[PDB]
């Protein structure tokens, strides 16, 4: 690695990953926390070109090398051979989009940076699979059923300690990028307390209970759905315009006002804060990823009309403090 | 005014070191990462541990800081370490107390004043949720020692009766009562100095 004596810092940044990290620092302009993180890992996922890796290939990779001892220490040699074989297979399938040496170096260096800050060349294989499957591009329900099955025993049961390990391994990623404090920091215990309060202090937690628990935007996990949501709104074209920068049409997200008529703003105009004189941005908004339908438009019209007669500032939120869960679209 | 001069000096120092840009949440996260939060406040630490904690805090602050304005991480870290050494160890012993470091971090961290007051009250509060009068006196003494480094110690000297001027010794200190005392117009010396420092920082920033 690299040693900086003047700052006394140990760095494992790949030069390509160094360029990626500089780009992330430049794109830090988003004032919002988890939206900025979602954009950042989207940049990283597109950069290391694993989005074209399928989930079934991930199952084949994990079950091919017989890696089922979750507590077994992992050495550099085994992971490099497995990862090289996987990217060689990907190049066999994606010859025009896969560079095996660069890809394996990027993946190994990424994992080394995130999970092995202790400079030991060893990391729990459970953390490895959780990270590589969180970065993996796939659907949603399959992801949760897979990681629950991975953590649960043959009976499909997961105790408090297991979910604590998963919580820690999950928050490891925001810790790498120095924004874990927004999701509550390294303290995973409050998440366990909330999950047990939901489950009325049940002795054990099953798959369906965990599904229902996370389907209500848990504070520490917001970076899983939002990420996918961003992945669902990178090629969406709306039939509208941005009232600030005169974009036509909006590509990507769409944001609609509620206490105004014929007001819409693009994603960049929203995160950056192009403050046009006359109207502020501290009012309730509505977020749209997919192109809208007529029913949604008329319902928004009705909501605006109803709000027009519910004035006098019943509820106000001037500071940001974290305004991530704007509104649910229910796909 | 001497209090006004001290508040202006503190605001200028915070602006130069960007201390107001670091929230207390980053501070507690760094302390948990360094395991100093679980450590006893009476346990001292070497200069290496404090330097590592400051460097980690600066690194996590800058990682989310846009490249639009590059920050001299090394120079800022050196200045912060020198200021902490001057405020906590005038004799240059090289050892920094955990309680003094925590109090200084809470004071210098920017964010909502109510949140900082609640955090300070929770830290002062014992396992039963009641603040300790001895803890309040120790905090006042540490604050007075810190104000001496800004060449304004006479206006904020170490007085044991100052806590008696804030709240009654025979009356329990609650979060609501502490917030009311701190936010009141006739605030005590420490509460007035905190509001004065906040006003000076707000004026300097805007
Ligand atoms: Zn726009």
Curated annotation (Swiss-Prot), chain A:
Residue ranges covered by zinc fingers (ZZ-type): 237-293
Chain spans, region Interaction with SYNM: 1-331
Subcellular location: Cell membrane, Sarcolemma; Cytoplasm, Cytoskeleton; Postsynaptic cell membrane
Tissues and organs where the protein is expressed, per its UniProt entry: Detected in quadriceps muscle and in sciatic nerve (at protein level). Expressed in the sarcolemma of the soleus muscle (at protein level). Differentially expressed during skeletal muscle, heart, and brain development. Also expressed in retina.
Disruption phenotype: Mutant mice show reduced contractile force compared to wild-types, at least for soleus muscle. They have decreased motor activity levels after exercise, increased muscle permeability and fibrosis with impaired regeneration. MEGF10 and DMD double knockout animals have pronounced fiber size variability and intracellular inclusions in the quadriceps femoris with extensive endomysial connective tissue infiltration. Mice develop muscle weakness, kyphosis and a waddling gait. At 2 months of age, they have reduced contractile force compared to wild-type mice.
Residues binding Zn(2+), per UniProt: 242, 245, 266, 269
Function: Anchors the extracellular matrix to the cytoskeleton via F-actin. Ligand for dystroglycan. Component of the dystrophin-associated glycoprotein complex which accumulates at the neuromuscular junction (NMJ) and at a variety of synapses in the peripheral and central nervous systems and has a structural function in stabilizing the sarcolemma. Also implicated in signaling events and synaptic transmission.
Quaternary structure and partners: Interacts with SYNM. Interacts with the syntrophins SNTG1 and SNTG2. Interacts with KRT19. Component of the dystrophin-associated glycoprotein complex which is composed of three subcomplexes: a cytoplasmic complex comprised of DMD (or UTRN), DTNA and a number of syntrophins, such as SNTB1, SNTB2, SNTG1 and SNTG2, the transmembrane dystroglycan complex, and the sarcoglycan-sarcospan complex. Interacts with DAG1 (betaDAG1) with DMD; the interaction is inhibited by phosphorylation on the PPXY motif of DAG1. Interacts with SYNM; SNTA1 and SNTB1. Interacts with CMYA5.
Name used for this protein in its record: Dystrophin
Organism: Mus musculus (Mouse)
Residues of the full protein shown: 3065 to 3395 of 3678
Curated annotation (Swiss-Prot), chain B:
Region listing for Interaction with MAGEE1, in residue ranges: 1-206
UniProt keyword list: Cell membrane, Coiled coil, Cytoplasm, Membrane, Metal-binding, Phosphoprotein, Synapse, Zinc, Zinc-finger
Gene Ontology MF term list: zinc ion binding
Localization terms from the record: Cytoplasm; Synapse; Cell membrane
First-listed, main subcellular location of the protein, grouped into a coarse class: cytoplasm
Keyword Cell membrane: yes
Disruption phenotype: Increases alpha-catulin protein in mdx muscle.
Post-translational modification: Phosphorylation of isoform 2 on tyrosine kinase substrate domain present in the C-terminus.
Superkingdom of source: Eukaryota
Tissues with expression: Expressed in skeletal muscle, heart, lung and brain. Sarcolemma and neuromuscular junction in skeletal muscle. Isoform 2 is restricted to the neuromuscular junction. Isoforms 5 and 6 are only expressed in muscle.
GO CC aspect terms: cytoplasm; dystrobrevin complex; protein-containing complex; sarcolemma; synapse
Comment text on domains: The coiled-coil domain mediates the interaction with dystrophin, alpha-catulin and utrophin.
Function: Involved in synapse maturation and required for normal muscle function.
Assembly and binders: Interacts with dystrophin, utrophin and the syntrophins SNTA1, SNTB1, SNTB2, SNTG1 and SNTG2. Binds dystrobrevin binding protein 1. Interacts with MAGEE1. Interacts with Ctnnal1. The interaction is required for correct localization of both Ctnnal1 and Dtna.
Membership in a protein family: Belongs to the dystrophin family. Dystrobrevin subfamily.
Entry protein name: Dystrobrevin alpha
Gene coding for it: Dtna
Region of the whole protein represented: 32 to 237 of 746
């Amino acid at each position: 690695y690299y040693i900086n004596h003047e700052t006394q810092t140990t760095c494992w940044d790949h030069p390509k990953m160094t360029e990626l990290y500089q780009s992330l620092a430049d794109l830090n302009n988003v004032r919002f926390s988890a939206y900025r993180t979602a954009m950042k890992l989207r940049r990283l996922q597109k950069a290391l070109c694993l989005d074209l890796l399928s989930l079934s290939a991930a199952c084949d990779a994990l079950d091919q090398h017989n890696l089922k001892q979750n507590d077994q220490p992992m050495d550099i040699l085994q992971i490099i051979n497995c990862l090289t074989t996987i990217y060689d297979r990907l190049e066999q399938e994606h010859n025009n989009l896969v560079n095996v040496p660069l890809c394996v170096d990027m993946c190994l260096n990424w994992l080394l940076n995130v999970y092995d800050t202790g400079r030991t060349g060893r990391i729990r294989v459970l953390s490895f699979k959780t990270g590589i499957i969180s970065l993996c591009k796939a659907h949603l329900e399959d992801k949760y059923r897979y990681l629950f099955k991975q953590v649960a025993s043959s009976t499909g049961f997961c105790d408090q300690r297991r979910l604590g390990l998963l919580l820690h391994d999950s928050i490891q990623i925001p810790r790498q990028l120095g924004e874990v404090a927004s999701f509550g920091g390294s303290n995973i215990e409050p998440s366990v307390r909330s999950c047990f309060q939901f489950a009325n202090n049940k002795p054990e937690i099953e798959a369906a209970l965990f599904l229902d628990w996370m389907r209500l935007e848990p504070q520490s996990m917001v970076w899983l759905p939002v990420l996918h949501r961003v992945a669902a709104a990178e090629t969406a074209k709306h039939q509208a315009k941005c009232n600030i920068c005169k974009e036509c049409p909006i590509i990507g997200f769409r944001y609609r006002s509620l206490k105004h008529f014929n007001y819409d703003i693009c994603q960049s105009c929203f995160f950056s804060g192009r403050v046009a004189k006359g109207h502020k941005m501290h009012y309730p908004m509505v977020e749209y990823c997919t192109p809208t339908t007529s029913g949604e438009d008329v319902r928004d019209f009705a909501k605006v009309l109803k709000n027009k007669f519910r004035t006098k500032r019943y509820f106000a939120k001037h500071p940001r403090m974290g305004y991530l869960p704007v509104q649910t679209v229910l796909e | 005014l001497s209090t006004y001069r001290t508040a202006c000096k503190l605001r200028f120092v915070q602006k130069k070191c960007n201390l107001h840009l670091v929230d207390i949440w980053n501070v507690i996260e760094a302390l948990r990462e360094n395991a100093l939060n679980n450590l006893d406040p009476n346990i001292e630490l070497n200069v290496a541990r404090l330097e590592a904690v400051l460097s980690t805090i600066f690194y996590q602050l800058n990682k989310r800081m846009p490249t639009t304005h590059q920050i001299h991480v090394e120079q800022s870290i050196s200045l912060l370490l020198n200021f902490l050494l001057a405020a906590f160890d005038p004799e240059g012993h090289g050892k920094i107390s955990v309680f003094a470091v925590k109090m200084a971090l809470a004071t210098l961290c920017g964010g909502k004043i109510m949140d900082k007051l609640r955090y300070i009250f929770s830290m002062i509060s014992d396992s039963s949720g009641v603040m300790v009068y001895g803890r309040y006196d120790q905090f006042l003494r540490e604050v007075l020692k810190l104000p001496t480094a800004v060449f304004e110690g006479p206006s904020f000297g170490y007085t044991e009766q100052s806590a008696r001027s804030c709240f009654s010794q025979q009356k329990k200190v609650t979060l609501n009562g502490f917030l009311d005392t701190l936010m009141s117009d006739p605030p005590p010396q420490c509460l007035v100095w905190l509001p004065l420092l906040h006003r000076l920082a707000n004026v300097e920033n805007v």
